[PDB]
Design a protein around this ligand. Structure first.
Ligand SMILES: CCCCCCCCCCCCCCCCCC(=O)OC[C@H](COP(=O)([O-])OCC(O)COP(=O)([O-])OC[C@@H](COC(=O)CCCCCCCCCCCCCCCCC)OC(=O)CCCCCCCCCCCCCCCCC)OC(=O)CCCCCCCCCCCCCCCCC
Ligand SMILES: CCCCCCCCCCCCCCCCCC(=O)OC[C@H](COP(=O)([O-])OCC(O)COP(=O)([O-])OC[C@@H](COC(=O)CCCCCCCCCCCCCCCCC)OC(=O)CCCCCCCCCCCCCCCCC)OC(=O)CCCCCCCCCCCCCCCCC
Ligand code: BCB
Ligand SMILES: C/C=C1/c2cc3[nH]c4c(c3C)C(=O)[C@H](C(=O)OC)c4c3nc(cc4[nH]c(cc(n2)[C@@H]1C)c(C(C)=O)c4C)[C@@H](C)[C@@H]3CCC(=O)OC/C=C(\C)CCC[C@H](C)CCC[C@H](C)CCCC(C)C
Ligand SMILES: C/C=C1/c2cc3[nH]c4c(c3C)C(=O)[C@H](C(=O)OC)c4c3nc(cc4[nH]c(cc(n2)[C@@H]1C)c(C(C)=O)c4C)[C@@H](C)[C@@H]3CCC(=O)OC/C=C(\C)CCC[C@H](C)CCC[C@H](C)CCCC(C)C
Ligand SMILES: COC1=C(OC)C(=O)C(C/C=C(\C)CC/C=C(\C)CC/C=C(\C)CC/C=C(\C)CC/C=C(\C)CC/C=C(\C)CC/C=C(\C)CCC=C(C)C)=C(C)C1=O
Ligand SMILES: COC1=C(OC)C(=O)C(C/C=C(\C)CC/C=C(\C)CC/C=C(\C)CC/C=C(\C)CC/C=C(\C)CC/C=C(\C)CC/C=C(\C)CCC=C(C)C)=C(C)C1=O
Ligand SMILES: CC(C)=CCC/C(C)=C/CC/C(C)=C/CC/C(C)=C/CC/C(C)=C/CC/C(C)=C/CC/C(C)=C/CC1=C(C)C(=O)c2ccccc2C1=O
Ligand SMILES: CC(C)=CCC/C(C)=C/C=C/C(C)=C/C=C/C(C)=C/C=C\C=C(C)\C=C\C=C(/C)CC/C=C(\C)CCCC(C)C
Ligand SMILES: CCCCCCCCCCCCO[C@@H]1O[C@H](CO)[C@@H](O[C@H]2O[C@H](CO)[C@@H](O)[C@H](O)[C@H]2O)[C@H](O)[C@H]1O
Ligand SMILES: [Fe+3]
Ligand SMILES: [Mg+2]
Lengths: 36, 50, 260, 331, 50, 273, 36, 50, 50, 50, 50, 50, 50, 50
């Protein structure tokens, strides 16, 4: 997110962070479940 | 048969294949929504566009 | 100031040029020439002046032998110690005392098997298919092979010698079953009860007949004989081909003489 | 004349037989063989069967994608006019970026499509190399062909990818197109000062001419002993007949030394490999460590010089512009 | 219904490897095409924006 | 001094001229009348090259250049330092090449071989003649031929090419280059296939001709065959020069414009403008 | 959608978003059912 | 049969193939309407067009 | 009524493979063609518009 | 009235494949030829008239 | 026969082939009328045309 | 008339294929050649008139 | 089997393969979060972007 | 689940080799593509910003 002085401060709450996590985490879950 | 698979192998493979295809398509749908939240890529019709 | 500089007058490309030459000449002299020496070496001097190393030791120019494991059986080495010595008592006499002097046949070189009529001491085995059958066979023994549709069938054609005299009749074709390729013509030779094989390369074939520049008609009688009727060994192939090749130089005396 | 060495007059036909079995993939050897008659005169008449495999499909898919990208951009170059596409085909091209973007991914309109096509072609070549290698392995053969092929692919990467990386610019890479990629040849030679003065250009040409000489000599030699069964080279390797003894003696009496029926193939492999190896080394040296090959040869004393025939004319711009502006951006 | 019988004719190995290659091609095309734009490139600093 | 299988092949006869006079070997070399003439031309031409280089501006091996006469001299003999040495060395080179080819004919006659190798060697000799004799004759002087020097003959090739504004568009050149690349690739394939069959791996069996056919039928769907690949290699190698000669001889005598404009025959067809 | 300031605020109610979802979701449904 | 399929296999394949093709074309129709809502791609005859 | 008999001659696998390749090529052509225009390009910032 | 006998000699599969390819080539030629004009191009902004 | 079709297979294929061809041509006719309404592509003879 | 005996020697399939290709080539030449002229191009806006 | 593996070998390889793949994907997820803390690579929509 | 039966038809050794090659290609493409940018290059001094 943007902090004081308009400088980025990364965090687990950044909305865009859930584009990669979703792309990576979601298959990783069901791959772990469907093929066992 | 033509592919060497038995009927039960065909049923098992079909089940798994369809499940995987649907799961992949559904995660693609979810991912595309998330990306739209990141970047709404089909912009509205601009002012002078015809 | 500059990329690639190693000194005032030393740069990377200059060194890589010499490195490239080193690669080329190391590969050529250290490896390729050693490979080239896997047949016919060590060299022999029948009329030499000095003592050479014994032919049965690894004398320094010789590569260490490699082993080919054959598809259908045993092993061969290269250099081959069994093919190292040739023992046939060639019918040839020296025209002069030194090794660089050519030899002259002592009579009937084509039958003797010297010069262009020389054959190699190949193994006396029938070359085979990868399925284990004899590779080169007449069409009478391979009914599953045939001449392609619309191509000239030479069976029944008259065979003429180099002197234009009719020498025989084509009786069969011999096909290579691995390659699907015709390699020999079998010829019933007129004046005997005898068939002679001829490599298809010595035959000029038309609808009228086949013509053989290599040998005279009368010389078809002396073509080397197959021990079996419907198969041929590798050494037999060498002998049969070399007979006609020797005829290229020996069929008539004029063929051995210069223009001027 | 041995007319068999010119063509095959009497073609032979036989059973439809499966080839030697591979360690895997016999299931993927597909197609009913067809026999076309004129092809059997100059070679084997039989077409097929062909092996599918996974790597073959990958090669086809990536290659077709690259071809589609190139062809579509060519079609866009004539504004999609089909008759003009047909007329102008040889002059059409998909070009790498014309502006300087460094190694950054360029826009679609100025090199992005070129980059995607180059990547697709690279992946198709990778898949086809896998096919070459693994088919050699499956049939129990050595992988010599695959390593020669690898050297060729490496040269393709040098001129399309590696040199742009080393100098830092996609604009240096080869465009796709019939006449355009030759245009690149000339522009690249000029930029780096006459490739005729690049020693590795000379090595690559020496080995290419050597391939011409070696294949002419070896093909003519095998044809000349074809009446002794010289074409059956594997058997001669394992049990040497008079054909290869005559071949060896011909070359020995001609030039004082000779190969064997096996080792002449090592010579051929080496020469073909060295074409690509020398070319790759030359391209990797160019621009990164040498800027002007002619001036490099002059520095190292190799370049010939000639008297002027017409009067010698000094540079009329001498000392009027900054020499950094020749190859560098002013700002 | 009898859809599993597709795998009695259509050879699952060839289908799975072909799909892997095909989807790789399309994914690479999309990712690199997007990186070849100013508007939808997510790697670089934003360009082409007044 | 002999290969272990050689002695039975060293028989008299097969010479074109000389008979028993020069029909002998020196070490491994067969001599003959044309071996004698080849040594004559080789020694003379190399010695003339040496002396002419000694009189040039640089003795660096790559900077040596022996050049033909000016165009004004036409076909006349030039002063030796001004093109006459080039003329003498050209004559020596032609004599050496033809002597070598004819000695190859004699050697192949002696061995009962087909004459394919000297006939194939005829092709580069013919290209040399096109470059140094036939095209100069059409252009009107020995000054159109290439000079003798490692880098200077490249300068001649370069400037000859740029005399027609882009030599890449020469159709004969396009055919010649296609054959050159096809030949190098086919030689790589053929050497690799033979070596792969004879050298499968660690203790593995030498494979067969059926494996050769199977490999290429798998990879590309076609196998040309064992004899046919040698025929094809000879064909491609020969066609490098056989089709290049047309572009070379045409450049100037049959075409004075830039080569790219020659394709106006296609581009300027009135039907599609 | 466009905020009061003309900035872009993406949301599920964006009309254009239903082009990709429609292209992706519709087959995803009937593929799940036709080959169920 | 030349294809090796039996009559019942051919009937089942035909049923599923026609259903799949029709469903594909129908989603094509719906998608094209949605795209038209995003970009009405066939503009009306402009002012001076003849 | 007898259309299913098509699959007794026309080889389902060949038709499915050919359609897959054909429709992929057509789709790529259309997407690339639209991307090459100014009016219907949906990736890049709108240009070509007065 | 005996036109059906054509399929006794002309191999329905070959005709179907040829028609598929042929009509595809014609359609591509027409669509791309129209797109090469200003008057009948429906993808791009209108050109060729003020 | 040379194609492998029997008499009745040939007749049924002919019937379906002709019906498909006619329907394709008819929808082409209708589509051309609709396109004409969108773009009247054969303009009348202009003023100075001879 | 004994003209029908032509089909005992001339192989109707060869003739049909040859005519198909031949007439297609002629028609393509005519259509695209006419489109390469100012006077008879019916697609583009009229050009080449004062 | 086609691959030559036994059922037990297939099961052993499958368990090891799925375990390795899941571990690889999970460390990818963790690593991508760490990188995001170093460089949050999907920027928010900038001003003037549409 | 019969997922392990996949390894009875897909040749684990070739799968592992292919996956190694594929993931190496992807990793190299990503690392070097990021290095080709100003914003996400982590080797060089930061460029592309004031
Ligand atoms: C100008 C022309 C000059 C020609 C001079 C000929 C002199 C021959 C001679 O005196 O021989 C006496 C000698 C006496 O014979 P003998 O007493 O019966 O035999 C004694 C031994 O038992 C038998 O010995 P051997 O059969 O084992 O001999 C092997 C052969 C070894 O030959 C080779 O290694 C050939 C090398 C091939 C070069 C490949 C070039 C391609 C790769 C690079 C491409 C670059 C691209 C850019 O000869 C040598 O050992 C080296 C000879 C050194 C003199 C070379 C000059 O005869 C020979 O040895 C014949 C071999 C000579 C071959 C000539 C090779 C010429 C290579 C030049 C091209 C290189 C370009 C760089
Ligand atoms: C896809 C692609 C797939 C492949 C496409 C198709 C493949 C095409 C390429 C095929 C491979 C190349 C085929 C070439 C085959 C040539 C051949 O088989 O020659 C063996 C053959 C060996 O003869 P033989 O069976 O031992 O004769 C029986 C005895 O030798 C007794 O002989 P003799 O003493 O009665 O002979 C007296 C001889 C005496 O002749 C001489 O001594 C003069 C020989 C001069 C040296 C060779 C000069 C060759 C120049 C060629 C230049 C090429 C480039 C030029 C521009 C084009 O006079 C003549 O025979 C005629 C005079 C000129 C002969 C040359 O040589 C000839 O007989 C002459 C053939 C020449 C035909 C082609 C000429 C060009
Ligand atoms: C800017 C100018 C260019 C140019 C100018 C050009 C010209 C003018 C000509 C060619 C020709 C040729 N060019 Mg081209 N060139 C080629 C390749 C080729 C060849 C395929 C072809 C034939 C070469 C030849 O005739 O040698 C001749 C080699 C001979 C004659 C060898 C003779 C050997 C002799 C018989 C025996 C000699 C033995 C030794 C003396 C003995 C040594 C003793 C040992 C012991 C040491 C490529 C692949 C490219 C690329 C990559 O762009 C290219 C670019 C160019 N060429 C530039 C664009 N080139 C020729 C051609 O055919 O064009 C249509 C030609 O005339
Ligand atoms: C010094 C050594 C050299 C050398 C060596 C070696 N070279 C090899 C090998 C070795 C060792 C192999 O083992 C390999 C092979 O297998 O051999 C049989 C191969 C190969 N060298 C080819 C081409 C080649 N070598 C050149 C040069 C040298 N080689 C130099 C000289 C040149 C030049 C100079 O231009 C060319 C063009 C292919 C035939 C083949 C790779 C196929 C591929 O990677 O396929 C990849 C697959 C595709 C691109 C898919 C193609 C799909 C269709 C058919 C194409 C589109 C069709 C569609 C209808 C669109 C129409 C338009 C379209 C036609 C435009
Ligand atoms: C299309 C077919 C082709 C082809 C074919 C074949 N090629 C053959 C044969 C066949 C079939 C043989 O049978 C014969 C041979 O034995 O092989 C071992 C041969 C040979 N190919 C050589 C060189 C070669 N092939 C080239 C090209 C092709 N080859 C094309 C590709 C090229 C190129 C392109 O540069 C070169 C340099 C020699 C090594 C050898 C001749 C020996 C000779 O002739 O001995 C006699 C002569 C000498 C040993 C020296 C003569 C020196 C003179 C007097 C003084 C120098 C004059 C000269 C003009 C100076 C030039 C300066 C320079 C800087 C500009
Ligand atoms: C350094 O030495 C080398 C060379 O010299 C330079 C080379 O040229 C080469 C070949 C070529 C290159 C390096 C240039 C092109 C290479 C690039 C871009 C990197 C390497 C990439 C490849 C070799 C191929 C690229 C292919 C892909 C990314 C698609 C991968 C998909 C595949 C293989 C099919 C999907 C299937 C699976 C993942 C599992 C199932 C697979 C099978 C049943 C069969 C697979 C078979 C095998 C043998 C792997 C190699 C390999 C080499 O080591
Ligand atoms: C040992 O002998 C040899 C063969 O025969 C056994 C060959 O087939 C081959 C392969 C050569 C060929 C197949 C002809 C050259 C063309 C090649 C390699 C690729 C060209 C493309 C095709 C042939 C595809 C044709 C399909 C239709 C070689 C190299 C060889 O050395
Ligand atoms: C008294 C008196 C007058 C004496 C004179 C004696 C005389 C004539 C001496 C001549 C001395 C001279 C001039 C020697 C020069 C010899 C020359 C031209 C040497 C050049 C060697 C070069 C550079 C060759 C280039 C080609 C090359 C790389 C060849 C290496 C590979 C080899 C050996 C190819 C030949 C070769 C081929 C092509 C096969 O197909 C084949 C098939 C089966 C078995 C063996 C062979 C084989 O050896
Ligand atoms: C690090 C990052 C981020 C990325 C790296 C990507 C990468 C590895 C890129 C590699 C690029 C490379 C190796 C490029 C090399 C290109 C080279 C060497 C090209 C050379 C010559 C090309 C030629 C002669 C091409 C000719 C092409 C044609 C004539 C194609 C014709 C096509 C058709 C007729 C098809 C028509 C189709 C129709 C639908 C319109
Ligand atoms: C960088 C990697 C390069 C590409 C790797 C592709 C490898 C191909 C996979 C197949 C490997 C196994 O191949 C098989 O090995 C065994 C081992 O004895 C051989 O068995 C003999 C088979 O004949 C061979 O076909
Ligand atoms: Fe060979
Ligand atoms: Mg237009």
């Amino acid at each position: 997110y943007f902090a004081a002085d308009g400088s980025v401060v990364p965090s687990i709450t950044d909305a865009n962070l859930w584009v990669p996590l979703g792309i990576l985490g979601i298959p990783t879950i069901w791959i772990a479940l469907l093929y066992r | 048969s033509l592919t060497g698979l038995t009927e039960e192998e065909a049923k098992e493979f079909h089940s798994v294949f369809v499940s995987s295809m649907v799961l992949y398509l559904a995660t693609a749908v979810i991912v595309h929504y998330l990306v739209w939240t990141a970047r709404p890529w089909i912009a509205p019709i601009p002012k002078g566009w015809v | 100031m500059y990329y690639g500089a190693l000194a005032n007058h030393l740069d990377i490309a200059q060194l890589a040029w010499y490195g490239h030459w080193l690669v080329i000449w190391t590969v050529v002299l250290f490896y390729l020439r050693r490979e080239d020496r896997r047949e016919g070496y060590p060299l022999v001097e029948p009329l030499g002046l000095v003592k050479l190393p014994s032919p049965d030791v690894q004398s320094g120019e010789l590569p260490y032998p490699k082993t080919f494991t054959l598809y259908h059986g045993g092993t061969v080495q290269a250099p081959n110690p069994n093919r190292r010595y040739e023992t046939r008592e060639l019918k040839l006499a020296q025209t002069d005392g030194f090794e660089g002097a050519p030899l002259a046949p002592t009579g009937n070189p084509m039958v003797d098997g010297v010069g262009p009529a020389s054959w190699a001491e190949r193994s006396e085995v029938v070359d085979s298919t990868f399925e284990g059958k004899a590779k080169i066979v007449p069409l009478r023994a391979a009914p599953e092979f045939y001449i392609a549709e619309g191509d000239l069938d030479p069976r029944g054609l008259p065979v003429f010698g180099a002197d234009g005299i009719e020498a025989g009749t084509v009786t069969d074709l011999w096909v290579d079953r691995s390659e699907y390729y015709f390699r020999y013509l079998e010829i019933s030779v007129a004046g005997s009860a005898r068939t002679a094989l001829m490599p298809l390369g010595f035959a000029s074939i038309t609808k009228d007949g086949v013509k053989v520049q290599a040998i005279l008609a009368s010389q078809f009688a002396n073509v080397p004989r197959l021990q079996s009727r419907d198969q041929i060994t590798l050494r037999e192939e060498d002998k049969v081909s070399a007979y006609y090749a020797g005829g290229l130089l020996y069929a008539t005396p004029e063929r051995a003489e210069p223009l001027l | 004349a041995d007319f068999q060495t010119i063509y095959t007059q009497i073609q032979a036909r036989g059973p439809d037989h499966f080839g030697p079995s591979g360690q895997w993939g016999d299931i993927d050897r597909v197609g009913k063989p067809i026999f076309i008659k004129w092809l059997g005169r100059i070679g084997d008449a039989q077409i097929g069967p062909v092996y599918l495999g996974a790597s073959g499909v990958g090669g086809i898919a990536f290659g077709l994608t690259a071809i589609l990208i190139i062809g579509f951009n060519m079609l866009a170059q004539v504004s999609f006019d089909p008759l003009q596409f047909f007329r102008q085909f040889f002059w059409l091209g998909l070009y790498p970026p014309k502006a300087q973007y460094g190694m950054g991914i360029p826009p679609l309109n100025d090199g992005g499509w070129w980059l995607m096509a180059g990547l697709m072609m690279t992946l198709s070549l990778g898949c086809w190399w896998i096919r070459v290698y693994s088919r050699a392995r499956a049939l129990g053969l050595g992988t010599h062909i695959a390593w020669n092929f690898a050297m060729a692919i490496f040269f393709v990467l040098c001129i399309g990818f590696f040199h742009p990386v080393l100098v830092g610019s996609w604009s240096e890479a080869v465009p796709f197109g019939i006449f355009p990629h030759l245009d690149w040849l000339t522009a690249f030679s000029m930029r780096y000062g006459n490739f005729y003065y690049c020693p590795w250009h000379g090595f690559s040409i020496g080995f290419a001419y050597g391939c011409g000489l070696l294949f002419a000599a070896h093909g003519a030699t095998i044809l000349a002993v074809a009446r002794f069964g010289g074409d059956r080279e594997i058997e001669q390797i394992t049990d040497r007949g008079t054909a290869v003894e005559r071949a060896a003696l011909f070359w020995r009496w001609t030039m004082g030394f000779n190969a064997t029926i096996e080792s002449i193939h090592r010579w051929g492999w080496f020469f073909s490999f060295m074409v690509m190896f020398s070319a790759s080394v030359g391209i990797l040296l160019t621009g990164t460590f040498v800027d002007n090959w002619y001036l490099w040869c002059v520095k190292h004393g190799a370049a010939p010089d000639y008297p002027a025939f017409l009067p010698a004319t000094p540079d009329p711009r001498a000392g009027t512009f900054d020499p950094r502006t020749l190859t560098g951006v002013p700002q | 219904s009898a859809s599993w019988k597709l795998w009695l004719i259509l050879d699952p190995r060839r289908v799975l490897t072909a799909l892997f290659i095909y989807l790789t091609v399309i994914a690479l095309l999309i990712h690199f095409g997007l990186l070849s734009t100013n508007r939808l490139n997510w790697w670089e600093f934003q360009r082409g924006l007044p | 001094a002999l290969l272990s299988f050689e002695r039975k092949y060293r028989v008299r006869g097969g010479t074109l001229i000389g008979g028993d006079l020069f029909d002998f070997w020196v070490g491994p070399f067969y001599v003959g009348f044309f071996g004698v003439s080849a040594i004559f031309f080789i020694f003379l031409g190399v010695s003339l090259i040496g002396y002419a280089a000694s009189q040039g501006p640089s003795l660096d091996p790559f900077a040596i250049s022996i050049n033909p006469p000016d165009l004004k001299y036409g076909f006349a003999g030039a002063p030796l330092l001004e093109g006459g040495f080039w003329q003498a060395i050209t004559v020596c080179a032609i004599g050496a090449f033809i002597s070598w080819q004819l000695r190859e004919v004699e050697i192949s006659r002696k061995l009962g071989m087909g004459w394919h190798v000297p006939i194939a060697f005829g092709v580069p000799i013919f290209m040399f003649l096109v470059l140094q004799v036939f095209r100069p004759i059409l252009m009107g002087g020995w000054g159109f031929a290439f000079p003798y020097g490692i880098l200077s003959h490249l300068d001649w090739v370069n400037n000859f090419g740029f005399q027609y504004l882009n030599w890449h568009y020469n159709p004969g050149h396009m055919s010649s280059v296609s054959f050159l690349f096809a030949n190098a690739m086919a030689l790589g394939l053929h050497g690799g296939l033979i070596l792969s069959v004879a050298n499968p791996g660690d203790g593995d069996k030498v494979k067969t001709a059926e494996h050769e056919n199977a490999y290429f039928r798998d990879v590309v769907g076609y196998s040309i065959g064992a004899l046919a690949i040698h025929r094809l290699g000879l064909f491609l190698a020969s066609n490098i020069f056989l089709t290049g000669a047309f572009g070379t001889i045409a450049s100037g005598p049959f075409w004075t414009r830039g080569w790219p404009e020659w394709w106006g025959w296609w581009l300027d067809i009135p039907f599609w403008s």
